[PDB]
Design a protein around this ligand. Structure first.
Ligand SMILES: Nc1ncnc2c1ncn2[C@@H]1O[C@H](COP(=O)(O)OP(=O)(O)OP(=O)(O)O)[C@@H](O)[C@H]1O
Ligand SMILES: [Mg+2]
Length: 120
DNA sequence: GTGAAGGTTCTCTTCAGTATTAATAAGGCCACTGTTAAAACGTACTATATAGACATCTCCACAAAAG
């Protein structure tokens, strides 16, 4: 039935290349190039997440033989009230590493070496 | 020829074991939530306690007619 496929499409999300998104992507390129920390702020449902998420898809990881993958940009969304250990786990899991045991210091230290290992 | 070394037997072990009255426990790190006083602290719907710009009435003093 034709109707089912259109409803199945219309319930799903899509990405539209708005100039608001292009503005962030060119700007994030400047901050990434300058290796500069910054923030993105705006009202709810203005599209910040979709623009940032689209930017991560624009710079998917790269690989070399017998080397870990290199991951130019990491995008994470913490859970609410994210403590340090769970932020390290978020970063670690995005880089596909695992850390089953350790102090918070051990989670931090493993995060530092996997971040610089993948060269984010 | 008193002393030293050496010989000899002593049984049966189907008997003894198995139950309570029991003490608060005897675990320690890490992290991570989620209560639990209880302390610190913004600001509301009120109950009064005045302080003083005004309006009012009253008492006393002056021009027109008649004998
Ligand atoms: N670039 C876009 N293309 C298509 N749809 C978009 C885009 N940006 C936003 N939307 C629509 O608006 C919704 C809200 O956008 P988004 O998730 O980016 O919100 P947000 O700005 O990160 O908000 P919040 O701060 O509330 O989390 C999306 O889920 C999507 O439905
Ligand atoms: Mg968002």
């Amino acid at each position: 039935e034709w109707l089912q496929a259109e409803i199945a499409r219309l319930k799903g999300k899509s990405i539209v290349p708005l100039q608001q998104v292009k503005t962030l992507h060119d700007w994030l390129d400047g901050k990434r190039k300058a290796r500069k920390s910054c923030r993105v702020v705006g009202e709810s449902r203005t599209g910040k997440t979709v623009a940032c998420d689209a930017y991560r898809y624009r710079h998917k990881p790269q690989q070399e033989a017998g080397r870990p993958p290199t991951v130019p940009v990491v995008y994470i969304r913490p859970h609410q009230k994210c403590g340090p250990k769970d932020l390290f786990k978020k970063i670690t899991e995005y880089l596909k590493y695992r850390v089953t045991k350790g102090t918070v210091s051990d989670f931090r230290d493993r995060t530092i070496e996997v971040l610089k290992g993948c060269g984010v």
